[PDB]
Amino acid sequence: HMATGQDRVVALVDMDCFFVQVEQRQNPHLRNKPCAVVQYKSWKGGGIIAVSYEARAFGVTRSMWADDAKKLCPDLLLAQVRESRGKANLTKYREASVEVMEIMSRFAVIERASIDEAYVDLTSAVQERLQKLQGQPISADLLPSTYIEGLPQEGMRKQGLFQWLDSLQIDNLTSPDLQLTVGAVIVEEMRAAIERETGFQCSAGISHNKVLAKLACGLNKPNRQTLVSHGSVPQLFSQMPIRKIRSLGGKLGASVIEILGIEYMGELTQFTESQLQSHFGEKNGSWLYAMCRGIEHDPVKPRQLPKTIGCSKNFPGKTALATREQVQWWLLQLAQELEERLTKDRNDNDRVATQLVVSIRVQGDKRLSSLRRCCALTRYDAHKMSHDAFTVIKNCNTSGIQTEWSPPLTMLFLCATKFS
DNA sequence: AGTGTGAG
DNA sequence: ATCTCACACT
Numbered sequence: 372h373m374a375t376g377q378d379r380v381v382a383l384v385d386m387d388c389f390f391v392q393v394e395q396r397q398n399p400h401l402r403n404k405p406c407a408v409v410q411y412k413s414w415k416g417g418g419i420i421a422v423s424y425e426a427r428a429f430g431v432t433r434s435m436w437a438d439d440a441k442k443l444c445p446d447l448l449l450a451q452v453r454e455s456r457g458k459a460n461l462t463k464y465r466e467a468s469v470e471v472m473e474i475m476s477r478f479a480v481i482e483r484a485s486i487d488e489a490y491v492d493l494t495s496a497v498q499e500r501l502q503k504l505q506g507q508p509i510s511a512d513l514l515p516s517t518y519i520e521g522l523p524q525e526g527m528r529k530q531g532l533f534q535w536l537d538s539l540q541i542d543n544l545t546s547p548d549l550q551l552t553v554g555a556v557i558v559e560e561m562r563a564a565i566e567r568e569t570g571f572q573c574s575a576g577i578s579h580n581k582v583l584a585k586l587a588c589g590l591n592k593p594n595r596q597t598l599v600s601h602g603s604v605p606q607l608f609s610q611m612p613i614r615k616i617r618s619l620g621g622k623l624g625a626s627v628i629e630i631l632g633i634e635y636m637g638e639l640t641q642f643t644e645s646q647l648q649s650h651f652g653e654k655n656g657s658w659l660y661a662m663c664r665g666i667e668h669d670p671v672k673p674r675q676l677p678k679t680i681g682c683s684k685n686f687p688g689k690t691a692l693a694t695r696e697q698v699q700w701w702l703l704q705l706a707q708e709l710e711e712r713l714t715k716d717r718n719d720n721d722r723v724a725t726q727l728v729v730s731i732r733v734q735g736d737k738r739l740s741s742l743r744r745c746c747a748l749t750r751y752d753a754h755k756m757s758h759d760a761f762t763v764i765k766n767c768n769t770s771g772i773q774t775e776w777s778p779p780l781t782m783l784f785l786c787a788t789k790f791s
Numbered sequence: 792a793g794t795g796t797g798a799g
Numbered sequence: 800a801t802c803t804c805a806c807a808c809t
């Protein structure tokens with residue numbers, strides 16, 4: 372069933388207001404109440420980074436000062452992420468993420484895609500489950516939080532699910548729609564286990580590829596899951612913004628919109644594959660041709676040890692690193708965080724990083740990074756690493772006066788790679 | 792390849 | 800993210 376890109380069952384799981392839920396687990400009084408998670412900033416109580424769904428009803432959004440949100444939601448409760456060596460401390464979140472990932476790994480192999488989301492390949496689990504119950508159909512009681520995109524044509528959810536279930540093939544075990552339905556069953560079980568063992572809620576999307584799973588996950592949030600079938604793709608794409616498709620959120624997507632004069636994914640269906648290749652190249656033209664028809668093949672890649680570990684910090688405008696002392700201090704601060712993480716990495720995976728990449732951005736440069744250089748990473752010593760990084764970046768101070776740094780630095784980035 | 796692009 | 804990480808590209 373590859374010709375129609377219905378060969379796999381893929382799901383994407385995304386935690387609802389992840390940081391808020393981890394905080395609600397520590398301090399119970401914040402549960403089922405409007406609350407938020409802020410990064411302490413002296414001005415206005417600090418910026419808000421995670422908002423509960425209860426608080427979103429009052430118009431609360433991320434990137435807005437706590438006091439202004441207070442005005443919008445006076446009952447609003449606050450949780451504050453600790454700050455360390457100029458950045459947020461996410462140990463708590465990484466550990467909760469690991470908990471959930473381990474729980475998901477029991478049902479099918481996963482691909483960790485971020486701190487709060489992961490792809491799941493259920494093809495094998497769907498086959499094995501298909502043999503386990505044959506002939507008896509699938510009752511709606513196994514899909515308490517599943518939405519069937521496009522149907523019908525909390526009450527609506529049940530009516531659409533009934534219309535979906537009444538038409539599912541029963542005997543053809545290779546039926547794409549049946550495989551998706553079973554995948555949604557397994558995801559319902561997965562999420563039930565996750566809640567039971569951690570108290571966390573989440574959403575999921577079930578379809579045939581990563582792109583459709585990602586779109587399906589966001590259709591019915593929170594604490595709900597959405598199944599997007601191949602037959603529902605035309606309707607779903609009829610008004611789906613091109614820039615909302617995974618990998619098309621940047622320049623390529625903008626280019627498609629500008630060159631073809633279209634806004635929705637579904638409009639790409641009218642162009643021929645040769646036209647798309649003549650305008651975007653063989654590879655992107657063919658990819659777009661199949662993607663606008665719901666076909667995509669990026670495989671779900673199991674456990675993978677990260678290829679890099681790094682951290683950085685930006686110093687915009689006034690904050691730009693101007694003296695030599697400042698650059699030395701921030702390099703040391705970054706290296707100390709790096710050391711902490713590299714140490715945990717070596718403890719958990721018995722591998723050591725052999726290369727240190729230093730990257731910096733000078734004030735006034737439009738590029739993301741002004742330059743990058745590499746040196747050996749022999750010892751997990753923040754002090755040593757700080758001096759090595761300084762040595763590769765020292766040439767960049769184009770000023771004979773030792774009293775300052777020129778041009779100033781607006782970004783410092785340290786990264787450990789070449790693991791072995 | 793080191794840079795640029797993009798997902799989260 | 801008003802950061803972490805992956806990887807495509809002669």
Ligand SMILES: Cc1cn([C@H]2C[C@H](O)[C@@H](COP(=O)(O)OP(=O)(O)OP(=O)(O)O)O2)c(=O)[nH]c1=O
Nearest residue numbers: 385386387388389390391420421422487592800
């Ligand atoms: C996108 C984003 C996320 N985060 C953090 C906090 C979030 O809890 C975590 C996951 O990010 P998101 O998944 O983007 O958002 P969310 O989990 O808070 O809520 P929902 O999925 O229901 O929309 O990463 C930021 O601090 N700044 C950001 O810009």
Ligand SMILES: [Ca+2]
Nearest residue numbers: 386387388487
């Ligand atoms: Ca989330």
Ligand code: NI
Nearest residue numbers: 754755757758
């Ligand atoms: Ni020293």
